[PDB]
Ligand binder design. Structure first.
Ligand code: GG2
Length: 112
């Protein structure tokens, strides 16, 4: 409950971060050696993640469903997202975001 809502606040904070392309603000939510799994392709380290952030399309995202799981000291969050692209094509995407005990992102899978 406590860790659930805090994780939820982080997700909705991430939605605004993604739409404003606040890539610095996004990276601050990560661990240094976290992995951004972009469609089966992992990017370990904040240097490879910042690139993933900058190469992302100019998209608008809307959350449509949050699934929070407690696997101990880690919270695994599944989020359904409506991804609207730069030319109006709306696509259903999904993210699997894992937080550690200090609410830092250790893994961030996005599957399309
Ligand atoms: C219109 O259709 C698309 C298709 C693909 C892409 N596309 N491309 C890339 C890439 N080639 O890098 C990425 C994405 C994407 O959808 N990404 C993302 C997914 C979901 C979230 N959200 C939302 C808020 C809170 C939770 C959360 O995780 C944030 C960013 C980043 C990566 C965009 C649009």
């Amino acid at each position: 409950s406590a860790r659930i809502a805090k994780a939820k606040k982080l997700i909705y904070k991430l939605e605004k971060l993604w739409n404003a392309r606040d890539n610095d603000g996004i990276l601050k939510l990560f661990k240094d050696d976290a992995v951004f799994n972009l469609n089966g392709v992992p990017y370990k380290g904040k240097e490879a993640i910042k690139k993933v952030l900058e190469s992302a399309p100019k998209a608008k995202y809307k959350i449509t469903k949050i699934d929070i799981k407690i696997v101990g000291n880690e919270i695994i969050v599944n989020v359904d997202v409506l991804a609207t692209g730069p030319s109006g094509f709306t696509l259903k995407v999904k993210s699997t975001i894992t937080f550690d005990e200090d609410m830092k992102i250790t893994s961030y899978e996005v599957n399309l």
